[PDB]
């Protein structure tokens, strides 16, 4: 029974008891209200009680009509009294490994299947039941206050629908989508995903380059793992550093530090193996590979 | 039906079936026939990589692990996913290549510091591989051997300059 | 346990307690009955209580035999205590938007699926499980007293079947149907539908008239939406009005009131763009578009 | 929790409360026992209550330890204080009309679907959930003590499986089966059905004979209905009648009675329109059509 | 709700009631605490009660906030006051009959489906929900300590996968598998199965040897059924027996004991119809058929 209906029913009992006791027994409205609560709660202090036969009959009726109603009301009342996050739309293996790598951050998971709640709660993420393509269920999972939304649904049509729903809610959040087919990459970028990660294209190109000898697949699957001695990290050039205007040919970062500078990125553009006259700026993101000691040495070298 | 498709005369077998149990079964069926052919598998789950390598696959390529690690590392900015997805496409300006070291070359015993590959040629040397191991960012005391594989990134003019520089 | 058996059991406890207290403690039959209720309900005012050892023992027996029996009785009692309507046959998108606009009235949704119960009750309608083609399941949903029945089923044959069933039940109710194909409009009107609405014919004509520029679709979907500034209203001419027997040329509604007279209706006919020699009568319905200030000016204009 | 353990627990609470109140508050053992019941039942008359701080603390402990224990005890106490049939396997329309015609007899229904229990219980038959092809579920529905089993399953393979299961349980019961295809009639007779009723063969032959004028379908669907003036009933010739050895040509039953003798059956063989020298016996079942007055006259004519 | 949270909630109610009654009604802290318990437990002696309008209102609030909280607290308190196994991976017909013969021991059935739980628990085994191919779901079902693991999954690739998983967990346990095709027996034995049973090969050979007369199928299905008179028993030769170093020609088991010596086994090999020069050893297993009196005579024959 809806809680609000139970509320009305108990209020009606309260009115019935209070008016009855007031008129039959002649006590004040306040005393009559108090007596009604004491009676229907089954407290029964006995400071007030009926002294007439009509009052006795009336009290038996209030007992029968009121005690059950009050009991159901209190139990229903019980129920009502008793950086940012990352939202993940859909549940797959890619999102499972992403959730493995995202320990220590607050992760919501928006999925349609109800029987995945055990593995979502075991992996360390809050589960939000719902359809990721619907704007109300997208909204509930706190898409507004997020810092990144990761979309991995069953097909590319549902992924594009989810991306357009998220862009209807928040036009500033970051969307990381996954392409299931190759030709839908530009369409997933047209819908509004900030970056499209196509895993089957990477897998097919590694399986094609691994016929002769598989050094490329070993390199990719080793530097992406946070278990090896060398790690791929992005250091930013701070505002007011010693490197503004200095080219990479004048810098020789691999000579002084020992990290391998494989790319320099600005904004959303990356140039792999930049030429010698590329002039550094403040804000350029250096993508390099080296040991964490070399990483700390590179941070100390490009300091303010 | 495996012996139908000429597994004995092949040089590489690529096994990507519907599930991982089927992949291990097909790898066992291949190793029944030709015990030395090269098998490239694909792991649909992270737990099955050691089983696919025990069953006989020379190279296991797990796409969902790579996708999850590129998803989790692109929350801030996706230069790593851009690097991975742009170095593999056979249309870009820079290419990842494997260059073998011939016998009788100019770099027998020469360390990587005295070889000075990046300033002379322009090829970013990300790893020197040998056999079935790959050493990413090798230290400065690493002495080369005739038979090593140099894995690098560069423009094809720099690749030709590297091949002409290590030539015998 | 059947409710009636629980009733007998609690009555037996009541007789036992009342007779016992009367004979052992010497209180009147009425006081003894009242004391029995107060005791087995666990209210226990203490205005009456046993004063003899036998009465104390008896009271403990009544407590043990009576409190559980009364508790089960009140909970079983709980269960039994705890213009005209519109019936909607079938559940789809058209009936969903119709239910969205029909707030405030009583709506009974008759549907085959049981899983639509939560969305029907969340949209604000009482769900009646059944088959809309059966006559008995139609009579369950109170078709006899309703003021309109809206039929929209899966196919067109099921719609004609439900219309024939409603016409077998009631020969006066208003039936609104939805045609799936253009050929079945005359069959639905012969079978008894008071109005047949064909959404695919309207959609095809709007999609074919929206090639060059789509002002027709904008006009239709703006005057049907009750969020815009202008609304399409039907204003009936009352008996004894000032406009009985005037032509629409001499009446000149648009400049004096501000509304746009797009058509006039009589009975079951409609005259769009009525010519200037059309003499008004009493009881005619004026179909117009205008701002609600102009609608109220037109309503005050046509007064008696 | 075993009922006897709950008994011990409540007795222990009673001892605790009684001894405590007696020693702390100084009331008699009997008053203390009574007070303990009144308190742990939450009646609380207040004729007795603690008047010392120690007694107040003790009473709060008794309330906490005793009220729940007493509640569980009373609820546990509640529990201790408080010709033959026809089995139908499967649910179809044919079994629905058979169950309509079988009012007043005890009917079990063995079906797999759980969501037919409402219509089975509304039609006047007990519902037994189960698979009709399984021998244990066949057995539960009391196939042994039945007088006839009616098998109408989805296909002919399941019908033959059900017939063989029933013949494994009871080799003497009567099985009435329904053929869905024409060629499976002899196989349904081989499995062990006593009579196979093929409705689509009857329907196809009536639809073939109803091209010119449909008098045959009117005759069949009228004499099978128990609503017309003429009824098809089988009268048996009793042991020791006036008709033994008398042929139908010497009898002239239609001349003396007015019933139409369309067939005479013996055992499981029926001869429609028997010839004139057919000698009657004792035990031959006369199949005739007539009004119930003519039926009673025919019963009085062939009497002993 | 965690028990400790309910504890805090009831303590908060107690503080609220005690402080309120003390300040509003002016009773001592101890009396106020006692009154609060008496009230929220619904005992209501009435020795103390509010005498001011504010106290009456406050008491109604305590009744509403406190009675439900106390009720939930007492019920939660109630709760605190009051050889080795065999694992079966997968559920089918073969594992069902294997579970029927394996009564008395502890059996853990590991299966993907959740709807097989009732039939597994009715057959007499503890159901463990999981995936038999996963290593973690294997380790959940206690494969490490078991004495045999029976693998029968949907396909043969899943069976090889589960065998590889069990061999990754434990290198000593006994694995029994079921082959679907004849080609995979060697792959299942290479993957680590201690015994491969192929039901379709046995069935095909029995169906091909049952064309002329089927005494082979009768022999197999009678000596495997534990309801016949003769049973196929394995009788091990103990250390220090009378038959160490005798040939089977000189031992002459069949005439002196009554059993039929069809084969002898050693380690993982079996010699069917062993020749007369075969010298017995200690530890050998004798495979024989006979009545249990003959089996006990053979057991007493081979004693130390």
DSSP per residue, E160-210: HHHHHHHHHH-SSS-EEEE-SSGGGHHHHHHHT-SEEE-HHHHHHHHHHTT
Q: In chain D, positions 67-106, which contact chain C (CB-CB < 8 Å)? A: 74-75, 77-78, 81-82
| CA distance readout (Å), D88 to D177, D190, E256 | 10, 20, 60
D266 conformational bin, left if phi > 0, alpha if psi -120 to 50, beta if neither: beta
Q: Which chains does chain D touch, 3 or more C-beta pairs < 8 A?
A: A, C, E
Dist CA D74 CA C69 (whole Å): 9
Selected for mutation to probe chain A from D46, D47, D48 (highest A CB count within 10 Å) is: D46
The length of chain E in residues reads 304
Residue at token pair 């007439």: A52
Dist CA B66 CA B84 (whole Å): 10
Chain breaks in chain C (C to N over 2.5 A) after: 82
Dist CA C290 CA D227 (whole Å): 64
CB contact at 8 A, A27 and A21:
yes
Nearest-10 Cα torsion for D19, D23, D28, D33? -20
| CA distance readout (Å), D270 to C84, D223, D262, D264, D286 | 62, 18, 10, 6, 10
DSSP secondary structure letter of residue C211: S
CB contact at 8 A, E162 and E145:
no
Are A and C neighbours with ≥3 CB pairs closer than 8 A? Answer: yes
Residue C161 in 3-state DSSP? helix
* Pick from E173, E179, E206: nearest CA to E192: E173
The secondary element (H helix, E strand) that includes residue D271 is: strand D269-272
Q: Which two tokens stand for residue B35?
A: 């015990």
DSSP D213-268: --HHHHHHHHHSSTTSS-EEEEEEPPTT-TTTT-BHHHH-HHHHT--EEEEEEETT
Beta bridge partners of A289: A232, A260
CB contact at 8 A, C20 and C58:
yes
Nearest-10 Cα torsion for E54, E55, E61, E64? -150
Beta bridge partners of D2: none
Q: Is A42 on the interface with D (CB under 8 A)?
A: yes
Dist CA E254 CA C213 (whole Å): 104
Q: Which two tokens stand for residue A241?
A: 């550093």
Buried-exposed string C263-302: b where 16+ CB fall within 10 A, e elsewhere: ebbeeeeeeeebeeeeebeeebebbbbbeeebbeebbebb
Resolution of the experimentally solved model in angstroms: 6.7
* Neighboring chain C residues of E48 at a CB cutoff of 8 Å: none
Q: Within a 13 Å sphere around the CA of C214, how many CA atoms are in the beta-carbon half?
A: 13
Q: Is the dihedral of CA E195, E201, E203, E206 positive or negative?
A: negative
Residue D190 in 3-state DSSP? helix
Q: Which two tokens stand for residue C134?
A: 């059966």
The length of chain B in residues reads 168
CA C275 to chain centroid, in Å, comes to 40
Q: In chain B, positions 123-142, which contact chain A (CB-CB < 8 Å)? A: 124-127, 129, 134, 136-137, 140
Dist CA E249 CA D147 (whole Å): 65
Q: How far is B5 from chain E (nearest CA, A)?
A: 18
Q: Which two tokens stand for residue E109?
A: 């059935």
* Neighboring chain C residues of A60 at a CB cutoff of 8 Å: 33-34, 37
CB contact at 8 A, E164 and E191:
yes
Task: Give every CB contact of residue C120 below 8 A, 6+ residues apart in sequence.
Answer: C91, C109, C111, C126, C127
Q: Which two tokens stand for residue D269?
A: 């063989």
Burial of A52 (0-12, 13-18, 19+ CB in 10 A): exposed
With helix as H, strand as E and coil as C, how does A222-267 read? HHCCCCCCCEEEEEECCCCCCCCCCEHHHHCHHHHCCCEEEEEEEC
CB contact at 8 A, D27 and D48:
yes
* Pick from D101, D100, D114, D105: nearest CA to D87: D105
For chain C, how far is it from start to end, CA to CA, in angstroms? 67
CB contact at 8 A, C175 and C151:
yes
List the single residue in D with minimal CA-CA distance to E80. Answer: D65
Question: Phi, psi (5° rounding) for residue C72?
Answer: -65, -35
Neighbours of A122 (CB within 10 A): 8
Q: Which two tokens stand for residue D44?
A: 């609380």
Q: Which two tokens stand for residue A264?
A: 């320099």
Q: Which two tokens stand for residue B92?
A: 């870009």
Dist CA C116 CA C127 (whole Å): 8
List the single residue in C with minimal CA-CA distance to E47. Answer: C46
Dist CA A194 CA A149 (whole Å): 10
CA angle, E130 as apex, E125 and E132 as ends, to 5°? Answer: 90
Residue C262 in 3-state DSSP? strand
Q: Is the dihedral of CA A177, A183, A186, A192 positive or negative?
A: negative
Q: Which two tokens stand for residue C137?
A: 């399941």
List the single residue in E with minimal CA-CA distance to B45. Answer: E134
Q: Is E44 on the interface with C (CB under 8 A)?
A: yes
Instruction: Consult the annotation and say whether C186 binds a ligand.
Output: no
Q: Which chains does chain C touch, 3 or more C-beta pairs < 8 A?
A: A, D, E
Q: Cβ of B21 and E187 within 8 Å?
A: no
Residue at token pair 């504890």: E7
DSSP D114-168: GGGHHHHHHHT-EEEES-TTSHHHHHHT--TT-SEEEE--SSHHHHHHHHHHHHH
CA angle, E156 as apex, E153 and E158 as ends, to 5°? Answer: 55
Beta bridge partners of C288: C233, C261
CB contact at 8 A, B74 and A259:
no
Residue C58 in 3-state DSSP? helix
For chain E, how far is it from start to end, CA to CA, in angstroms? 66
Dist CA A233 CA C260 (whole Å): 69
Neighbours of E257 (CB within 10 A): 23
DSSP chain E: --HHHHHHHHHHHHHHHHHHHHHHH---HHHHHHHHHHHHTT----SS---SHHHHHHHHHHHHHHHHHHHHHHHHHHHHH----EEEES-SHHHHHHHHH-TTS-EEEEES-STTHHHHHHHT-EEEES-TTSHHHHHHTT-SS-SEEEE--SSHHHHHHHHHHHHHH-SSS-EEEE-SSGGGHHHHHHHT-SEEE-HHHHHHHHHHTTSS--HHHHHHHHHSSTTSS-EEEEEEPPTT-TTTT-BHHHH-HHHHH--EEEEEEETTEEEES--TT-B--SS-EEEEEE-HHHHHHHHHHT--
| CA distance readout (Å), C73 to A300, C8, C18, D210 | 81, 10, 18, 64
List the single residue in D with minimal CA-CA distance to E10. Answer: D64
* Neighboring chain D residues of C72 at a CB cutoff of 8 Å: 78
List the single residue in C with minimal CA-CA distance to D34. Answer: C56
Q: Cβ of E161 and B29 within 8 Å?
A: no
CB contact at 8 A, C110 and C86:
no
| CA distance readout (Å), C36 to A24, C42, C63, D30, D44 | 21, 10, 10, 21, 14
Dist CA A150 CA A193 (whole Å): 9
Beta bridge partners of A270: A265
What are the counts of helices (DSSP H) followed by strands (DSSP E) for chain B? 7, 7
Dist CA E241 CA E299 (whole Å): 11
* Pick from C247, D61, D113, C243: nearest CA to E81: D61
Q: Within a 13 Å sphere around the CA of D34, how many CA atoms are in the beta-carbon half?
A: 21
CB contact at 8 A, B68 and A97:
yes
The length of chain C in residues reads 304
Residue B108 in 3-state DSSP? coil
Residue D86 in 3-state DSSP? strand
Task: Give every CB contact of residue E113 below 8 A, 6+ residues apart in sequence.
Answer: E91
Q: Which two tokens stand for residue D163?
A: 């017939």
Instruction: Consult the annotation and say whether A106 binds a ligand.
Output: no
Dist CA E227 CA A299 (whole Å): 82
Q: How far is E145 from chain B (nearest CA, A)?
A: 23
Q: Which residues of E participate in the annotated binding site?
A: 152, 178, 180
Neighbours of A184 (CB within 10 A): 20
Beta bridge partners of A183: none
All domains in chain A, ordered by first residue: 2-81 (1.10.287.70), 84-198 (3.40.50.720), 199-226 (1.20.5.870), 227-304 (3.30.70.1450)
Q: Which two tokens stand for residue A77?
A: 């009342």
Q: Which two tokens stand for residue D171?
A: 């080799």
List the single residue in D with minimal CA-CA distance to A39. Answer: D43
| CA distance readout (Å), C239 to B52, C246, C284 | 90, 14, 10
Task: Give every CB contact of residue D264 below 8 A, 6+ residues apart in sequence.
Answer: D248, D270, D271, D274, D278, D280, D284, D285, D286, D287
CB contact at 8 A, A132 and A162:
yes
DSSP secondary structure letter of residue C85: -
Instruction: Consult the annotation and say whether A284 binds a ligand.
Output: no
Buried-exposed string A238-265: b where 16+ CB fall within 10 A, e elsewhere: eeebebeeeebeebebbeebbbbbbbbb
DSSP chain A: --HHHHHHHHHHHHHHHHHHHHHHH---HHHHHHHHHHHHTT----SS---SHHHHHHHHHHHHHHHHHHHHHHHHHHHHH----EEEES--HHHHHHHHHTTTS-EEEEES-GGGHHHHHHHT-EEEES-TTSHHHHHHT--TT-SEEEE--SSHHHHHHHHHHHHHH-SSSEEEEE-SSSTTHHHHHHHT-SEEE-HHHHHHHHHHHTTT--HHHHHHHHHSSTTSS-EEEEEEPPTT-TTTT-BHHHH-HHHHT--EEEEEEETTEEEES--TTPBP-SS-EEEEEE-HHHHHHHHHHS--
* Neighboring chain D residues of E82 at a CB cutoff of 8 Å: 1, 9
* Neighboring chain C residues of E42 at a CB cutoff of 8 Å: 42
CA E185 to chain centroid, in Å, comes to 27
* Pick from A230, A280, A263, A231: nearest CA to B94: A263
Dist CA C147 CA E124 (whole Å): 61
Residue at token pair 């409009």: C185
Dist CA D92 CA D51 (whole Å): 75
Q: Within a 13 Å sphere around the CA of E190, how many CA atoms are in the beta-carbon half?
A: 12
Dist CA A207 CA C66 (whole Å): 80
Q: Cβ of E157 and B51 within 8 Å?
A: no
CA angle, C283 as apex, C280 and C286 as ends, to 5°? Answer: 65
The length of chain D in residues reads 304
Buried-exposed string D27-55: b where 16+ CB fall within 10 A, e elsewhere: beeebbbbbbbbbbbbbbbbbbbbeeeeb
Q: Cβ of E42 and C42 within 8 Å?
A: yes
User: How do B133-136 and B149-154 pair as beta strands?
Assistant: unpaired
Chain breaks in chain E (C to N over 2.5 A) after: 82
Q: Is E191 on the interface with B (CB under 8 A)?
A: yes
The secondary element (H helix, E strand) that includes residue D177 is: strand D174-178
The length of chain A in residues reads 304
Q: Which two tokens stand for residue C227?
A: 């969020």
* Pick from C70, E55, D39: nearest CA to A38: E55
CA angle, C131 as apex, C128 and C137 as ends, to 5°? Answer: 65
């Amino acid at each position: 029974v809806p809680a609000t209906r139970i509320l009305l029913l108990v209020l009606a009992v309260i009115i019935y008891g209070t008016a009855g006791f007031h008129f039959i027994e002649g006590e004040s409205w306040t005393v009559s209200l108090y007596w009604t609560f004491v009676t229907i709660a089954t407290v029964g202090y006995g400071d007030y009680s009926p002294s007439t036969p009509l009052g006795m009959y009336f009290t038996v009726t209030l007992i029968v009509l009121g005690i059950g109603t009050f009991a159901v009301a209190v139990e229903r009342l019980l129920e009502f009294l008793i950086s940012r996050h990352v939202v993940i739309c859909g549940w797959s293996e890619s999102t499972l490994e992403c959730l493995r790598e995202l320990r220590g951050s607050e992760v919501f998971v928006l999925a349609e299947d109800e029987n995945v709640r055990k593995k979502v709660l075991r992996s360390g993420a809050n589960f939000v039941h719902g359809d990721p393509t619907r704007v109300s269920d997208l909204e509930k999972a706190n898409v507004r206050g997020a810092r990144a939304v990761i979309v991995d649904l069953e097909s590319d049509s549902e992924t594009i629908h989810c991306i357009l729903g998220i862009r209807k809610i928040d036009e500033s959040v970051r969307i990381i989508a996954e392409a299931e087919r190759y030709e839908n990459i530009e369409q997933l970028r047209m819908a509004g995903a900030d970056q499209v990660i196509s895993p089957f294209v990477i897998s097919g190109r590694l399986m094609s380059r691994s016929i002769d000898d598989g050094y490329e697949a070993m390199f990719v699957q080793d530097v992406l793992a946070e278990e090896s001695t060398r790690r791929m990290v992005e250091v930013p050039i701070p505002e007011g550093s010693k490197l503004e205007g200095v080219s990479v040919l004048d810098a020789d970062i691999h000579d002084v530090t020992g990290v391998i500078i494989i790319g320099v990125g600005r904004g959303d553009e990356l140039i792999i193996d930049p030429p010698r006259d590329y002039s550094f700026r403040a804000g350029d993101i250096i993508l390099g590979i080296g040991k964490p000691e070399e990483i700390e040495r590179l941070k100390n070298y490009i300091s303010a």
